[PDB]
Amino acid sequence: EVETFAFQAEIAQLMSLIINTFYSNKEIFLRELISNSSDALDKIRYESLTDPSKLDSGKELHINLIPNKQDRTLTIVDTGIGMTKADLINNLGTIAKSGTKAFMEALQAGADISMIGQFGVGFYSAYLVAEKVTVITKHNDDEQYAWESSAGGSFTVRTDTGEPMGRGTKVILHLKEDQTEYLEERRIKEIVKKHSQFIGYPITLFVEK
Numbered sequence: 001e002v003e004t005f006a007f008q009a010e011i012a013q014l015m016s017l018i019i020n021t022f023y024s025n026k027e028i029f030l031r032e033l034i035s036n037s038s039d040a041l042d043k044i045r046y047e048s049l050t051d052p053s054k055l056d057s058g059k060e061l062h063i064n065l066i067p068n069k070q071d072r073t074l075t076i077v078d079t080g081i082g083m084t085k086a087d088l089i090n091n092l093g094t095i096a097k098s099g100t101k102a103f104m105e106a107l108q109a110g111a112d113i114s115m116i117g118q119f120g121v122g123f124y125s126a127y128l129v130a131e132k133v134t135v136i137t138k139h140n141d142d143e144q145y146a147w148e149s150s151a152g153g154s155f156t157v158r159t160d161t162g163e164p165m166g167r168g169t170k171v172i173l174h175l176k177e178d179q180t181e182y183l184e185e186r187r188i189k190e191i192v193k194k195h196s197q198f199i200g201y202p203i204t205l206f207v208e209k
């Protein structure tokens, strides 16, 4: 049972700007997703201080980076707080509306796409390098869901029948044909060292078989 939704016009406009604008410094997508993971880990850690049972779904707080050349995917996995169905369908897009408008205004005033995270909509920089994004997520208060979009104005949400995650989020980047450098170990190491060196959680870069 797959549900198809329309993006709000403003978010669809943001996605088209990310896809269509000429902008060579694409590597910042990884910093933006890792920053999102770190924020989600901060949240579950803070909540667990006053309710230890929130970690019954997993005590480990970490980030895994998993390249797969066979699938041409880069997956960013965290064990953070995860997202609810309402987050996926409405809450996060609602918040992103104001950040998008401010980001668009800043771009016309001289900012560049690398500053997208200062407006709270860094997730959408995934479309700098990905033709399709699949997000698997599990929040303590909700079921496991798969969100997916190839842009074009729509996204889908379904209950995920796959391997249970416990708690957290998996962002699966189906990379564009000319963006496979982000599957190379040395390239990912370089980018993590450059932009994510002080993240307060272990980042494990998986090796390919």
Ligand SMILES: N#Cc1ccccc1-n1ccnc1
Pocket: 036, 087, 088, 092, 093, 096, 120, 121, 122, 123, 124, 135, 147, 169, 171
């Ligand atoms: N990750 C993520 C995500 C997935 C679906 C919709 C919105 C999302 N999002 C936007 C900003 N932070 C998170």
